[PDB]
Paper text:
The human assembly factor Coa6 participates in the biogenesis of the CuA site in complex IV (cytochrome c oxidase, COX). Here, we present the crystal structures of human Coa6 and the pathogenic W59CCoa6-mutant protein. These structures show that Coa6 has a 3-helical bundle structure, with the first 2 helices tethered by disulfide bonds, one of which likely provides the copper-binding site. Patients with mutations in Coa6 suffer from mitochondrial disease due to complex IV deficiency.
Finally, we determined and refined the crystal structure of the pathogenic mutant protein W59CCoa6 to 2.2 Å resolution by X-ray crystallography. The structure of W59CCoa6 shows four molecules (A, B, C, and D) per asymmetric unit. The noncovalent dimer observed in the WTCoa6 structure is maintained for W59CCoa6 (between molecules A [cyan] and B [gray]) through contacts along Helix α3 from each monomer. The superposition of the WTCoa6 structure with the noncovalent A/B dimer of W59CCoa6 yields a r.m.s.d. value of 1.2 Å for 113 common Cα atoms. These minor structural differences originate from a slightly different association between the monomers in the dimers, rather than specific structural rearrangements. Importantly, in the WTCoa6 and W59CCoa6 structures, the positions of the proposed Cys58–Cys90 Cu(I)-binding sites are identical. Under reducing conditions, the elution profile for the W59CCoa6 protein was identical to that of WTCoa6, corresponding to a dimeric protein.
Residue numbers in the entry:
A (entry chain D): 50 to 113
B (entry chain C): 56 to 111
C (entry chain A): 56 to 113
D (entry chain B): 49 to 113
């Protein structure tokens, strides 16, 4: 998986996660960005980032 | 692998395999994985030119 | 190793220390080592804008 | 530990220097300008590495030919 593929995957993840921050984890507002994210990233990266997002957002509330 | 490190090892394989890219697919991956695509485009043009100049 | 991994670890440190860059100088080095300078400049503008937007509303 | 940009600039400076040496069959004198640009562009331990790497590669070529 090339450096350009990583750049493009990260960019698509940045935009997707940004949307989620501006709509309190509401997938329905970020449908096209989620689609680009899946199109832009290897299957095992998508799983990594989805699980990381859960951990981080739940750790916040456990701490809150 | 530093970008120019992975590039130099790819170029070494090309040398040792008479410029036949088919023999160097593994090292082509590490190169692509180590270097921005803009740099790879530059590096491919420098190599193509310099190897051609060599034979000339 | 991956440019965005090193960026995210640097940004995680900035969060944890009240956006205080002086604490996170180690991971700033690894960020600079992992990412081309053109990407760093963009990422630094993105962070400045987003962190500022955080306050401007909250 | 040098940044990615520092490694890139070191590599470019090294490339142009090694190119010059190839065009003058290792004659240092005709590349002194590029030599200087290589030393300023590269950390001390990188200069050492690429100098010893150059020697090994050139002498390995002669040994085999």
């Amino acid at each position: 998986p090339s450096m350009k593929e990583r750049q493009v995957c990260c960019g698509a993840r940045d935009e997707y996660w940004k949307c989620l921050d501006e709509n309190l984890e509401d997938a329905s507002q970020c449908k096209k960005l989620r689609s680009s994210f899946e199109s832009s990233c290897p299957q095992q990266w998508i799983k990594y980032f989805d699980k990381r997002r859960d951990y981080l957002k739940f750790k916040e509330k456990f701490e809150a």
